[PDB]
RNA sequence: GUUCACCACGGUGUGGUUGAUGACUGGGGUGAAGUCGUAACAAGGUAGCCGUAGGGGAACCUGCGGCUGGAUC
RNA sequence: AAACUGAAGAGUUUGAUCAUGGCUCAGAUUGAACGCUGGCGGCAGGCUUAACACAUGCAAGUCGAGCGGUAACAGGAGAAGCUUGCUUCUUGCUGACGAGCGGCGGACGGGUGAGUAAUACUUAGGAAUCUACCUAGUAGUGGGGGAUAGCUCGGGGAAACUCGAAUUAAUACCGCAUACGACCUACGGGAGAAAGGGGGCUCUCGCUAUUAGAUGAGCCUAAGUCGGAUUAGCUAGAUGGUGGGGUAAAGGCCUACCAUGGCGACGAUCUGUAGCUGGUCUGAGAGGAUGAUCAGCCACACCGGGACUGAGACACGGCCCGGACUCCUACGGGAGGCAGCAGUGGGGAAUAUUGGACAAUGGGGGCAACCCUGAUCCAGCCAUGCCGCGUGUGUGAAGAAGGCCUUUUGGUUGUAAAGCACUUUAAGCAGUGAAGAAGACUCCGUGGUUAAUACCCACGGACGAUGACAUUAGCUGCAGAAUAAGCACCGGCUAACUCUGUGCCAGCAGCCGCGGUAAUACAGAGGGUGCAAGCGUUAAUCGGAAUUACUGGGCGUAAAGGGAGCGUAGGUGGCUCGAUAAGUCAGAUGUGAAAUCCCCGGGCUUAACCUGG
């Protein structure tokens, strides 16, 4: 970077990345466990999954961490698996 | 290529620089050229009057 | 540019006078050469061609004028596009030029001269419909229907002016122009039609050479 | 909203039939109207027409690939 | 957002702007959205110097163009009148 | 951090296309007061021409079939 | 009312002719080059080659009214050595302000055309999306916590920079609490925010969730859009479907399985070439050629790849990795990307200043003040083009001299010159002098706001703070013809003819051709012709060329009927009564950007130019 304000932007941008990418892997860890659960085809411990994650799910969707259209849609796609696995 | 030096008297030899422009010589096979007289190394016709500018030659003082 | 060199052997090139000369002598008597063309030869053998009827036609009315290749091309290209007749357009559009128009009235001995007086800064215009009179020093203005022509307040007292009115008064005064000569003043009334200039110009032999 | 007509050359995929639409496109600079063609692949949900048929398509939002047509209505069938 | 600008046509030391609707990120004199009328700086007194269709100049406020301080003046001096 | 997956550079092998060059070689053209003939144009002195085959320093010749764009009849 | 106006041929095959048919020419045009010459102004244009490599300077900052603060700076208050008017040290106390955390901007504006023959462009539509700033709404903005940059303390490094310990603030970050909308729902219920700052409890700038606009972006469909068949077969995630993933969003975008599809002589595939368009040149038109400057879209940013942050980038002057090159180094390591604006080297036939200012129009930041802006507005260089003006004007004959020709005396240069009388455009000199400026600030008044006559905002007045250009444009005076003409051609095409020299030599030439001792064709002169601050030459496109013929040609013998037939695709197709309305025609509507072209006007003294409909 050749002037001050793109120096500042990129030792901006790694502090913003490490910050969101901990809270990105956040995201992910949180569905493991109801795609986990799914492969065991066990609908106690799915919904005891499914249920843990959707407030990790969209609070991180409200931070930006993913957009709500994706907590929206992993909800959804997950709530029409575990419903349809003997409801 | 070959061009066509025209004009009374040239001062060419091997290793001059010269400018080519189109236009051939009908009488010539195999000549198509015609050597800019005046340009880089090729001098202008010395005792040109009429058509000077045509031979690169200056205006007579 | 314009041409400066000698006028009688101009129109010896067209074998017509040109007005080249103010008429204090006779055309015959200023020249008394003008049966031969200029030059060592001048009138000798070879047929003419359809194109030197046609260039000598155009070369005349451009040199009547005083007006070069390049602005009478432009003219042509006016008349063309114009409505009407174009060789009828063309003959208004150089009548209608306003260092012409100073030597209709009566204020130039020649159009040379009035040439030198519209350029020099000596004629005001006043364009119909404007109330100022603003001062003009380019030729080839187009007057249009109701422009007024005045001298210079400065130069209203030339006497190269005065003598140029005298002079003028033998020649005529056309009927599309009103001139003053106590007030100095005049008033492109209308620009000249067709049947009012002469009739040994053939402008149909100007547009036939503009066409290749 | 976009209907178009043509017949049927071909019903062997899944939920999908290729249509031949023809069109007289006008050589531009000889005058004379040339019949062209383009084969447009449909979606036909039931699999219900063969080829052969005249059938109306509906452009929509794109199915698959090249599918983003739809049957809407079968006014002929095979003779 | 989008402006209610102008942009600079005529000549060199002899301008004349045309207001224009457009986004706010193209050039000047680039892509607009509508042209609603012109402005002659140098100008005479029987002449119409200032033009602007107050229609759509109003259409486009209740819409959310944000006129310039050239522009917003032009019509502040032109409904006076 | 480690490891696996994807992957850029890079490497290897074998082909395709294409430019420049190449001893030598084939025909094409241009150039003079060349050498050998005289094949065609007249019935061009054996009518010419087409396809094909054989032959011959070279134009060309000969056979077979075809044509008149062959004169004399 | 108007946009409705436009079409030329010649030379050259022959002893001669007509036809055929090529070649050549006269025209227009240029981002032009070169040769000779060169006065000025206005307006445009100016690396077409090396997407070659780039020295140096500038091209993206801004906010202290988010925050701790105090490196400089300027003050202010007190210590006053007081050295009596020298003068310093403490203090963020104030104007402010370097670095730092934080926000917004940097995704625009600007450049280039390498790639790209189709994720492109043009035209017409579509649905399954997101959208900072802006407009109009709706519900809020509650209450806590743990850190940390700068600042310290200690190291490492030649530098670039870096490591550790301690640690403070925030509109930085993370819980908890609530949620009109919004999201998921099996529709019973589940889960999800935020932040404060400023002006005198209010208002305002903010922030949060969201709706509808507008704007922008992404996506899709159909039609159109270069050449080659001496490239005919092309495809295996390939064609379609389901489950799942992925995206802001449809979708083989990805994946597992299932089927065996998909494309192609209406040109797939493979190649070569190319940014596309409005437009530009040409042309009577139809066409042909082209895609500079202006505008729209696309793609790219030393080369290959990956992403981050963000509303928006896979980011021109951002990050990471790899590479080539260039540079610094203490040899361990590091730094960089002018296809931004100037400019350099190089390449080239060839294309400019290392300029000024943010005054204007815009853009970024800010409450403002104000700062930034090589966008832009200007200035510089260049006859590169278009347009305009000038280099004088009248009058002047026993028709002077000089040149040239000549029948030796006439002709011609020629009213041309001289002489005489004028004029001062442009340039020069001196004055004067608009407009580009939008009237910021500050003050008053009105209205809204309010608990309030504060504050804030809107409106109405006063006022003059602001001009790079700039010594402006213009206008008025002074002087003196004073400072200002060249280029090509003159056998025919093609306007314009004679001598002298030369002697198939020297040379000319677009073509036909000229030159071999009397050359209108070479070279020089005189005279003339055409253009003119230019004129010629070369390159290039169209024209003439009806010479690819659609408009608008031919095929007995001039080039040209396939050796003949059968026949596939295709093209075309009898009569009569119906139906349909696809083609066809008409009408309406939407769209066909602006500019350009044309018509009618209007402003530059005219014109070029600009401009309204």
């Not at chain 2, 025209?6 to 050597?35: A, M």
């Not at chain 2, 800019?36 to 001098?43: E, T």
């Not at chain 3, 030729?139 to 422009?147: A, E, K, N, T, Y």
Request: glycine letters at 6%; one cysteine or more.
């Amino acid at each position: 970077a050749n002037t001050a304000q793109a120096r500042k932007r990129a030792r901006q941008n790694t502090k913003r990345r490490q910050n969101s990418a901990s809270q990105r892997s956040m995201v992910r860890t949180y569905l493991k466990r109801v795609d986990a659960a799914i492969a065991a085809k066990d609908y106690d411990a799915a919904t005891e999954a499914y249920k843990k994650a959707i407030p990790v799910l969209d609070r991180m969707a409200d931070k930006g961490i993913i957009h709500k259209n994706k907590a929206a849609r992993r909800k959804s796609r997950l709530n029409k698996t575990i419903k349809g696995l003997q409801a | 290529v070959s061009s066509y030096i025209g004009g009374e008297g040239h001062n060419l030899q091997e290793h001059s620089v010269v400018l080519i422009r189109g236009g051939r010589v009908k009488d010539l096979p195999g000549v198509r050229y015609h050597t800019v007289r005046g340009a880089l190394d090729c001098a202008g016709v010395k005792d040109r009057k009429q058509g000077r500018s045509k031979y690169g030659a200056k205006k007579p003082k | 540019a314009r041409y400066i060199g000698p006028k009688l052997k101009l129109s010896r090139r067209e074998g017509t006078d040109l007005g080249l000369k103010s008429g204090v002598k006779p055309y015959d008597v200023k020249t008394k050469k003008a049966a031969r063309p200029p030059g060592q030869h001048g009138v000798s053998r070879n047929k003419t061609s359809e194109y030197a009827l046609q260039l000598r036609e155009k070369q005349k009315v451009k040199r009547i004028y005083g007006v070069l290749e390049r602005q009478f091309a432009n003219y042509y290209k006016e008349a063309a596009r114009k409505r009407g007749a174009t060789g009828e357009n063309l003959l208004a559009m150089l009548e209608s030029r306003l260092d012409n128009v100073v030597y209709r009235m009566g204020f130039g001995s020649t159009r040379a001269e009035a040439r030198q007086l519209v350029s020099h800064r000596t004629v005001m215009v006043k364009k119909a419909g404007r109330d100022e009179f603003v001062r003009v020093n380019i030729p080839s203005i187009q007057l249009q229907d109701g422009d007024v022509i005045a001298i210079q307040e400065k130069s209203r007292e030339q006497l190269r002016i005065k003598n140029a009115i005298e002079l003028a008064t033998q020649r005529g005064i056309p009927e599309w122009l009103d001139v003053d000569h106590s007030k100095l003043q005049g008033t492109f009334k209308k620009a000249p039609d067709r049947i009012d200039l002469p009739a040994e110009i053939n402008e149909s032999l100007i547009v036939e050479l503009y066409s290749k | 909203a976009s209907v178009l007509t043509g017949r049927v050359v071909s019903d062997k995929m899944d939920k999908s039939i290729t249509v031949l639409i023809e069109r007289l496109v006008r050589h531009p600079l000889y005058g004379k109207q040339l019949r062209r063609s383009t084969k447009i692949k449909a979606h036909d949900e039931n699999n219900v027409c063969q080829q052969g048929d005249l059938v109306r398509i509906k452009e929509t939002r794109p199915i698959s690939k090249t599918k983003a047509w739809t049957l809407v209505d079968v006014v002929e069938k095979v003779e | 957002m989008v402006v209610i600008r102008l942009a600079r046509g005529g000549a060199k030391k002899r301008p004349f702007y045309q207001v224009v609707v457009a986004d706010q990120r193209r050039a000047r004199d680039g892509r607009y959205i509508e042209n609603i009328g012109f402005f002659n700086p140098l100008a005479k007194e029987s002449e119409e110097a200032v033009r602007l269709n107050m229609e759509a100049y109003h259409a486009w406020i209740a819409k959310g163009a944000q006129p310039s301080d050239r522009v917003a003046s032009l019509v502040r001096a032109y409904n006076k009148a």
